[PDB]
Symmetry: D2
Subunit: 302 residues, 4 copies
């Protein structure tokens, strides 16, 4: 019994197909709100998401402590562990702490690990092989590399990606680089599952052989994103591009506000208060919230 | 009687679906070779192309005279006019000469006009509206805007594109900019037919609602490109991405050699001598030709 | 008898020290205005400029014919030939026409030749050596390479620059690339005279060993530019940076309007009407002219 | 009694004139080596440096603990506190920890604070005002903003810089952005002391009104850097550009190796072992060390 759709199925047994880098809810005073975290996770999954990245960029990994992370992880697992892949962001720009975070996540029962390219310090590609190498050797949990030079300062070059694909636990890439020329070949060569790490390219990556997405706007239009995926899967391409174009306003808003502020502001607008972000990240002001409502109504999610 | 496929059909009655910016063959001494031009055009069309851009970038518009252009145009029209859309490159960075070239092409019976964004001088967007405006008013021939900041120095901004889509003869865009965020919305808003102006994004543009391509590597793999299109059209997406990935080496070669040198060198390697380019453009040296043969054999076209 | 100042004197006997890429005056109907051209040249030189580039970017080389160029050149030579170096822009993206333009300029008595990197077509560096090579072999007139990837699409790489510095007539570079790392070494290695091709870096280039400038804003503040040079030359650095900062508003305006529109609009505002530019280039509208007056008054030149 | 040189003296009473972002020495096993830290600081200052940034990028702030930082700071202060300005890097991409680090540094007796633009998360400019605002309100220690979009992902926009210059403790900018157009005006407007944060622009910034540098290559050529400064100060510009060009190879090496690896590898080569960097940063391999020796000998420092 097997029914092959049009979408590559590579690594979906570890990272799912349609998911989001979930926000980390905070109370009015900036404290982590575990209850709202479990609420949001169940909400999103019930909406169609089958994967959740906890402690990712959108999850505000820079302003949360290691304990807060582990806490959210264990809490969400108890909530939606039986029906969604839970991916833990454990990469930092310090190999030692990256290792610590990965071991803690493994013991917590994480289905996968998101390891961003070390940011700010700009290590050499040789440094990347040593960094990722150490992390992959610390646990048996599947790893999804996170390529995003726009935030980290350096990219994971093609040759480097090919070497890393040789490690037994490195099985996927969240791609926020958008180098379609290089990726088109790597997807075929490395055997790595490629996930869209940039909402405007969700449909684009599926067409090139992607396995799914790890979205931001998915917080505001989870059902739509699932539909984008299924549409492509079933060959209803016209439907896919209509949905993709439909959600454009959310992309524009993300561009003006940033993933964190947008995700938290959009959920609140839909009646799900998950607090505000921690400094230096900020919630949208009155004028920005007005522009956001506009985009959300145009996107058909408000 | 109508059978809707998955590909947008916008403007294909003027610019076709699968075509290439055809090379302008030169004899050993640098003179235009009309006979080889007609030979190549018939060859490409018989291979599956239903559109040809004459005097485009790949056609070496910078080193050919206005007379040589008109000549190739009239010659190709006599050869494949009854079965392919002929698009004439007429844009320059001088509004007066751009107008002159467009009128000459109209009288020659061109099915469409390719008008690149003025290069080098970097006019303002207001200047673009006046430039394109004058050209569109000079003839009744459908116009395809050519957006490629990488060669011209400036892009056709979104607002500017929306204004231009109001002119009755402006019906399409060759996109070599790759701003998927902006284009996803423009395609739906302006009603303009969008054509892939960058081979690695051919499949990507179809997924976003594109109408076809105006390729470079199409010179070396015309049948494959047609298949890429038909595959998408029929819903065979797996086939589409396999073909796309298959042709990657050609893209790499274009990246190392440039469209002109690659197109002319590749045809020669397949037994179709169309000469060398005119300075400052140069044919690949011995070492480069070796790397090219490699890519062509990997791409399955040699 | 010799009094060494702080400024490098390399190649100033061919290209001068303080000059501008002069505009090409047009009458109300777009025709070349030779009289105003001679008027402006005498005006600028009397103001302190000792060099003039005719038919450069700012001189609207894309919209003027070869005859109009030769005409302006011969006219200005008759006007200020006995007291200013006249540099002729002869580079195009066609090696044949570039050669034609250089020979015509040589016969006209040009003191130097400005040869921009071929634009739009993006030739390989090998193509550049062949292109510049052919031009340098056609006449005995000193050549100043014009490096500006921002307009042409490609840069003159360092290794390429080193090879070209070996040709006996290649003696200078107008630098509009701003790669201070590479240039700092090339200036010392190649022995080429380096000229600032970007007003905000005029003072910066002198500090790194430059020989002078080929300005745009110099049209509006010729005396000031001369003073910037002399100040540095005499060691009055405080004065130099005060003048440099003082002229900043002009740079901002050039950034909003482009060199051509700015140069022609600024002269008109100072009582010297040199017409408007030719399409696609456009004069500033009413609102832009207001902002320009503001910048000019702040710069102290209105 | 006052003798004005050519260099701006703004804020040098808090941040000095010639200094480096000092490395954080580690023993063979990766542990902090306080003794070598004090040795290097005394060495550099005796060589001519009058300022030292501790826990900066080059000081490997990403892989060292808060305690290790405070420790190095207190240790260096005891060593060279009576003759050099000690600047503490305290900025992170978490406002709370940035505040914690700044208070700890204040109590330690820091002469100034270096606060980098929050990296990776890409906050809005409004977020920057709130971030820097909170930090500046926590202590009375002079603050030097660190603008470097190349590492952080976002820049400190001009308007944002103008607002921040209003806070009483914000008195300087380490500039690693290189936007000479914007800075030329900000230096005059904001009254902020500008420091070169990129070695190839050290001389460039002095010419534009800079107050000094916070170098990387200064580890390998401290006396030369001091001479670069004094030369400019005394009006010996020819000497200044000869020194600047002379040190170019070090810049090239920094470009290939990165500041940390270069600084530590270069010191070792000069007989001062400060260990290797912590992962993901890596020391140069055998081949790289050979190329480095070459550059150092050419730079005249080996």
């Amino acid at each position: 019994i097997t029914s092959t759709g049009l979408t590559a199925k590579t690594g979906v047994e570890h990272f799912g197909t349609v998911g989001v880098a979930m926000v980390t809810p905070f109370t009015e005073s900036g404290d982590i709100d575990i209850a709202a975290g479990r609420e949001v996770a169940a909400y999103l999954v019930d909406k169609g998401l089958d994967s959740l990245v906890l402690a990712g960029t959108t999850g505000e990994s820079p302003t949360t402590t290691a304990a807060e992370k582990l806490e959210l992880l264990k809490a969400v697992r108890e909530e939606v562990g039986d029906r969604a892949k839970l991916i833990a962001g454990v990469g930092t720009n310090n190999t030692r702490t990256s290792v610590e975070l990965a071991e803690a996540a493994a013991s917590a029962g994480a289905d996968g690990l998101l390891v961003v390219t070390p940011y700010y310090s700009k290590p050499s590609q040789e440094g990347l092989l040593a960094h990722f190498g150490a992390i992959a050797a610390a646990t048996e949990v599947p790893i999804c590399l996170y390529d995003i030079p726009g935030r980290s300062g350096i990219p994971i070059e093609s040759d480097t990606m090919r070497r890393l694909s040789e490690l037994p636990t490195i099985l996927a890439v969240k791609d926020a680089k958008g180098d379609l020329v290089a990726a088109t070949s790597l997807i075929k060569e490395t055997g790595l599952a490629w996930y869209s790490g940039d909402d405007p390219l969700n449909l684009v990556w599926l067409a090139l052989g992607g396995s799914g997405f790890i979205s931001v706007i998915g917080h505001a239009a989870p059902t739509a994103l699932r539909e984008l995926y299924t549409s492509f899967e079933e060959g209803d391409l016209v439907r896919a591009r209509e949905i993709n174009a439909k959600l454009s306003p959310l992309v524009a808003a993300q561009g003006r506000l940033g993933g964190v502020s947008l995700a938290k502001a959009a959920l609140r607008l839909q009646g799900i208060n998950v607090g505000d972000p921690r400094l230096p990240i900020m919630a949208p002001n009155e004028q920005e919230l007005e522009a956001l409502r506009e985009d959300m109504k145009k996107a058909g999610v408000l």
